[PDB]
Design a protein around this ligand. Structure first.
Ligand code: CL
Lengths: 199, 243, 100, 9, 274
């Protein structure tokens, strides 16, 4: 009936190692499931765990199962940006399976000699929205926004490919004024010291 | 694979009914519908253990289904309530009472609005690489920004000279409310295209992000002064420059 | 597709103590399929309410059932069973023999 | 206690 | 002695009528402790022995849920098998299932079984090792291949050794006063006039438990077993059983045959003369 999944959300560095968890009533256990769920796509069967003490493991990923004190860990060894996604957990009730809250995971890619810097970009209708841009945005904050009320922020960490190195964790902010003002649009955040302003 | 599921996106005027189509071609006995709403993840609606057999789930209220055949498991929404806004999935598995994992359908995004009045197409805009980013690390970055749309049904691509590029692009995973307070908010979507500083310096190039919006159909009543917010593409284009 | 014919036994529960208060049993087993109508009778009259146990089956997959009613025996009364089953052409009637 | 699941033939 | 918990499943299709009839019953050594019938007014798994009533809260939620799940499997099972044997929606057909485990006198897991028949005739069954299957035919062979890839026997081993036993033991502790109580065979003899030359002699055994028993006769220790009729054991209706053996005898020559009887109840293999 109840499939708890914890923690709900975690950001970890590239190359680090987490190991989230999913616990369930051990009463009437028969089988367990794990799913990789890439953001905005279909969930995808990862493991199918059944017997006690048995420890399935695929790629840099693994899993255990303790059917008596109802729990299962999902470990990730040397972790990668690609391994970012919401990980789900289901147990039977029919003939049925009941998914847990689901644990969303982000893996922030670290960088070839980081270039923390803030830039401003103008539109094509002269002076409007002049989007702000924060390259190599350090994620010590990354809660949601920053200095926001009549400002909009959609900073998110992405990846490839390769030529002069590329793993996209920038940030971006804009508004309805143009009187907005970059190099100032990221207040509620706690950016680094070497951050670079061109004016 | 696999489980084909139609349609992808959909807007509905409260009280309107609808059939969600999902079909498989693998002889999977078991088929089921889950919905998705933040905080509870996947909750089960109606499930089906074989042809002719249908059975209720965690949250069956307001939906019904049929299974006269092995392949299809249609989700009919009797009478749309605004609490029927959600993301739907159709999942199947080979053997009933078996342990196999569910191979999931594509998924469909459903928004149930009071008045179709609430539907807005987006406004795509492109933004020239920082003339100081090039002078710093020798890289150029184009930013595409779509704003003020509802509901959050869009696909954002780019186009160099006329080819759909995936190299170097980083879109947002999901549209964001302009201000999470609250439901008068439209949605937002951005993408960075980072290419060589000297490749955007080349004025011969035609950069273009496009955004397909999924909205109204010439079919729903349209009685407002503004354009009809149908399904349609919208593009902000640009050219390189060494000036 | 196997079809088997019932075996029928009509008996009391305890000893054959007359006038007293015993139980009348019709145990029918060894039959296929599971559909089977049973009746108990007091002098060829269909006994009102009868209990019967939960359908089960033995090692060869064959079916059995108990059919019982609380009754007061006389040195005069007449008890029997009226079984029907697709393997029968007519309902098998079995008189209840006390002093077997 | 029943087996939790019996798979189809 | 040993001890048992077995579950018996019977689902029968009904063309014109609606959903197929489903009866499941649970036993603990010759004692049914629960039942489910798809046509019962309750639509829940019910108690059949006063020692399972003393456990009436959330125990009946899972049992009811998993029994309704089993029924679901059997509903499909009827289509699959109909397709296999190329049958039609005309007549009625029958699947059966029976599983459970045995424990010894120590109560350490002794045996575990799981079998399945279609229309009376065996179809597929789980061997003693609980790792492999026996296919009655080529259709049952498809279920063996399917079931192998579904790893059904593995999930069976686990339950048959884990939960199946762990609970037998539980029930045994819960209802020690009747389940672990063995009654004695109160035996007697009779003698009937079949004509004017020949007699009978019927040897009885009543109000006993468990149902395992033995009876015969012998002329000079040399067992007769000719001209007899050893009827099947019959339930009394109160948890006790009955049985009898009969013989044909010349009304003169009789006292050369005895009557053997065996049973847990009392030690010495009781013998009877007329
Ligand atoms: Cl359960």
């Amino acid at each position: 009936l109840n499939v708890e999944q914890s923690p709900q959300s975690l950001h970890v560095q590239e190359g680090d190692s987490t190991n989230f968890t999913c616990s369930f009533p051990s009463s009437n256990f028969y089988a367990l499931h794990w799913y990789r769920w890439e953001t905005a796509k279909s969930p995808e069967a990862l493991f199918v765990m059944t017997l006690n003490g048995d420890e399935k493991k695929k790629g840099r990923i693994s899993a255990t199962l303790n059917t008596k004190e109802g729990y299962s860990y999902l470990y990730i060894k040397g972790s990668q940006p690609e391994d970012s996604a919401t990980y789900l957990c289901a147990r039977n009730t029919g003939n049925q399976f009941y998914f847990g809250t689901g644990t969303s995971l982000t893996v922030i890619p670290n960088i070839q000699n980081p270039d923390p810097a803030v830039y401003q970009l103008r539109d094509s209708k002269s002076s409007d929205k002049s989007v702000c841009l924060f390259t190599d945005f350090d994620s010590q904050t990354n809660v949601s926004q920053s200095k926001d009320s009549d400002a909009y922020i959609t900073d998110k960490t992405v990846l490839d490919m390769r030529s002069m190195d590329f793993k996209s964790n920038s940030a971006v902010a804009w508004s309805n004024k143009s009187d907005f003002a970059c190099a100032n649009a990221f207040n509620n955040s706690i950016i680094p010291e070497d951050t670079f302003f061109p004016s | 694979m696999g489980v084909t599921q139609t349609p992808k996106f959909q807007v509905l005027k409260t009280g309107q009914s609808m059939t969600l189509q999902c079909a498989q071609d693998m002889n999977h006995e078991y088929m089921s519908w889950y919905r998705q709403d933040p905080g509870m993840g996947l909750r089960l609606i109606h499930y089906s253990v074989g042809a002719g057999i249908t059975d209720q789930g965690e949250v069956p209220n307001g939906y019904n289904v049929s299974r006269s055949t092995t392949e299809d498991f249609p989700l009919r929404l009797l009478s749309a309530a605004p609490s029927q806004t959600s993301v739907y999935f159709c999942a199947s598995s080979p053997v009933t009472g078996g342990i196999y994992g569910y191979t999931f359908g594509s998924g469909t995004r459903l928004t149930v609005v009071e008045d179709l009045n609430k539907v807005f197409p987006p406004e795509v805009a492109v933004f020239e690489p920082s003339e100081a980013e090039i002078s710093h690390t020798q890289k150029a970055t184009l930013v595409c920004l779509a704003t003020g749309f509802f509901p959050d049904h869009v696909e954002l691509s780019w186009w160099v000279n006329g080819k759909e590029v995936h190299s170097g692009v980083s879109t947002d995973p999901q549209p964001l409310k302009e201000q999470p307070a609250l439901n008068d908010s439209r949605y937002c979507l951005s993408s960075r295209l980072r290419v060589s500083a000297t490749f955007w310096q080349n004025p011969r190039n035609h950069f273009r992000c496009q955004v397909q919006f999924y909205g109204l159909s010439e079919n729903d009543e349209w009685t407002q002064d503004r354009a009809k917010p149908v399904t349609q593409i919208v593009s902000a284009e640009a050219w390189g420059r060494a000036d | 597709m196997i079809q088997r014919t019932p075996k029928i036994q009509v008996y009391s529960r305890h000893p054959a103590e007359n006038g007293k208060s015993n139980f009348l049993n019709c145990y029918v087993s060894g039959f296929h399929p599971s559909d089977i109508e049973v009746d108990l009778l007091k002098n060829g009259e269909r006994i009102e309410k009868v209990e019967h146990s939960d359908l089960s089956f033995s090692k060869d997959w064959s079916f059995y059932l108990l059919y019982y009613t609380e009754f007061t025996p006389t040195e005069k009364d007449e008890y029997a069973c009226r079984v029907n089953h697709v393997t029968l052409s007519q309902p098998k009637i079995v008189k209840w023999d006390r002093d077997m | 206690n029943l087996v939790p699941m019996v798979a189809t033939v | 002695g040993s001890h048992s918990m077995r579950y018996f499943f019977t689902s029968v299709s009904r063309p014109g009528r609606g959903e197929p009839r489903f009866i499941a019953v649970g036993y603990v050594d010759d004692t049914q402790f629960v039942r489910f019938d798809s046509d019962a007014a309750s639509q829940r798994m019910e108690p059949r022995a006063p020692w399972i009533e003393q456990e009436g809260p959330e125990y009946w939620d899972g049992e009811t849920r998993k029994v309704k799940a089993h029924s679901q499997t059997h509903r499909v099972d009827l289509g699959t098998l109909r397709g296999y044997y190329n049958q039609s929606e005309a007549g009625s057909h029958t699947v059966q299932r029976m599983y459970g485990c045995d424990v010894g006198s120590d109560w350490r897991f002794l045996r575990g079984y799981h079998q399945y028949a279609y229309d009376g005739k065996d179809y597929i069954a789980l061997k003693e090792d609980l790792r492999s299957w026996t296919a009655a035919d080529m259709a049952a062979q498809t279920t063996k291949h399917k079931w192998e890839a579904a790893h059904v026997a593995e999930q069976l081993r686990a339950y048959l050794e884990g939960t199946c036993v762990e609970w037998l033991r539980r029930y045994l502790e819960n209802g020690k006063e009747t389940l672990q109580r063995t009654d004695a065979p109160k035996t007697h003899m009779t003698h009937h006039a079949v004509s004017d030359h020949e007699a009978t002699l019927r040897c009885w055994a009543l109000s006993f438990y468990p149902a395992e028993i033995t009876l015969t006769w012998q002329r000079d220790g040399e067992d007769q077993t000719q001209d007899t009729e050893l009827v099947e054991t019959r339930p009394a209706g109160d948890g006790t059983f009955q049985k009898w053996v009969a013989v044909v005898v010349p009304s003169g020559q009789e006292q050369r045959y005895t009557c053997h009887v065996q049973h847990e109840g009392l030690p010495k293999p009781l013998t009877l003369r007329w």
